[PDB]
């Protein structure tokens, strides 16, 4: 009977001089803290029990109390930053790192979990866990010929804790820590368990969310083809982080973007740009907008893969955030594209949805659309066809919108719109 103990009874048992009474009371605490309904974390903290639990972590001759106190401290560290800090302040970090080497797998796993919660608080505790030396023993647990010999839940918890050591910015994780973790991360990215794949992908997405040097560290390990394969997964919890990572990577240099293209990513975008999950569609369109900001041959590969009609589709009908990203993709396309590429854009039907979006309450999207329209008109000039385009815009009703924009609040807006009128509709 360790069920429904009072905190006072727990304190009584833990303050006894009897390791087995302490074990019973720690288990009672664990059971209080592992209920879903409002676990009494703060009451346990106020009772002063964290130091006792931390001391129990070191009791090698009573592994049950190591496990029970590890679980209790895990659940305390799962709370607010103040509660996690309470666990850190009691000395828990080195004690958990020492438990990583336990011969009992359920105890090492519980230490992995606790360290995941501590690191998940934020950059400072993440880096403090690293400074206390957690990475080496964590990776040692994964240094096996075949990850399949490990228990599924254990492997999942190891992957998740590793992902938290890769998470967060200001600052990003230490460069040497990333380099030390990456080979194991790449091995996890090839594992067959959906949750391991998802959390590995999330870690890779964290590591690519930064300057081009971080992106390059990742790309050099050769993960882009595997990311593209996972971009094609049926499980949405895998697609989402794989797509996040791909989008991050194409924020980099034209060469890193080209590595994404060469791996076959564009072939997946017909489905991504029509995906029923709004956030997938939005992130896919954001990624496209960064690809169309690249080189003219990269725009050409966007064309060859049949993706301009899919951008026309998103512009015609999508969540408004997705539509704004699509407008960005079009402006980048027209800013970097050849005359022929811009003409092709017009032939795909861009004008009417582009115009229909000008009645938006968002000023940024209006600016973006007007810039795109100007670039298209410049290509038309280069071809001597500006009247055709003006007639198109007028026939679908866009000229009325542009005229209405003459009396717009923002300076750039009415500057742009009256330039258009005086230059092409006079």
């Amino acid at each position: 009977g360790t069920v429904n103990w009072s905190v006072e009874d727990i304190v009584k048992g833990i303050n006894s001089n009897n390791l087995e009474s302490q074990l019973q009371a720690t288990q009672a605490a664990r059971k209080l803290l592992s209920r879903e309904k409002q676990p009494p974390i703060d009451n346990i903290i106020r009772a002063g029990l964290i130091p006792k639990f931390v001391s129990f972590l070191g009791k090698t001759d009573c592994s049950p109390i190591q496990f029970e106190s590890a679980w209790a401290l895990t659940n305390i560290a799962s709370g607010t930053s103040e509660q996690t800090k309470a666990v850190v302040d009691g000395g828990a970090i080195p004690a958990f790192i020492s438990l990583l080497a336990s011969p009992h797998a359920h105890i090492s796993e519980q230490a992995v979990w606790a360290l995941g919660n501590i690191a998940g608080d934020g950059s400072a505790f993440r880096d403090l866990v690293i400074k206390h030396g957690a990475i080496d023993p964590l990776l040692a647990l994964l240094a096996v010929p075949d990850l399949s010999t490990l228990a599924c839940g254990y492997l999942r918890n190891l992957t998740w804790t590793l992902s938290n050591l890769c998470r967060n910015k200001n600052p990003a994780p230490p460069l040497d820590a990333v380099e030390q973790i990456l080979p194991t991360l790449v091995r996890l990215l090839h594992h067959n368990d959906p949750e391991v794949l998802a959390d590995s992908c999330w870690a890779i997405s964290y590591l690519t969310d930064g300057p081009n040097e971080r992106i390059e560290m990742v790309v050099k390990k050769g993960v882009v083809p595997q990311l593209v394969k996972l971009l094609g997964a049926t499980e949405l919890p895998i697609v989402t982080p794989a797509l996040r990572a791909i989008g991050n990577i194409v924020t980099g240099t034209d060469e890193q973007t080209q590595k994404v293209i060469d791996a076959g990513a564009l072939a997946v975008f017909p489905s991504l740009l029509t995906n029923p999950k709004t956030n997938i569609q939005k992130e896919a369109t954001w990624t496209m907008s960064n690809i169309t900001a690249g080189r003219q041959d990269q725009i050409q590969q966007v064309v060859n893969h049949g993706l301009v009609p899919f951008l026309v589709g998103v512009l015609s009908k999508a969540d408004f955030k997705t539509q704004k990203e699509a407008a960005w993709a079009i402006t980048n396309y027209t800013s970097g594209g050849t005359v022929e590429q811009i003409v092709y854009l017009v032939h795909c039907g861009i004008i009417e949805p582009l115009m229909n979006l000008l009645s938006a309450k968002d000023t940024k999207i209006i600016q973006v659309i007007l810039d795109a329209i100007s670039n298209i008109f410049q290509a038309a000039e280069k071809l001597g066809e500006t009247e055709k385009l003006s007639i198109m815009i007028e026939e679908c009703g866009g000229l009325d919108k542009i005229e209405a924009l003459q009396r717009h609040e923002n300076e750039s807006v009415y500057k742009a719109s009256l330039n258009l009128i005086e230059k092409y509709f006079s």
Partner: peptide
């Protein structure tokens, strides 16, 4: 994924 999680 969550930043933290309790064991229930």
């Amino acid at each position: 994924p969550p930043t933290k999680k309790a064991r229930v």
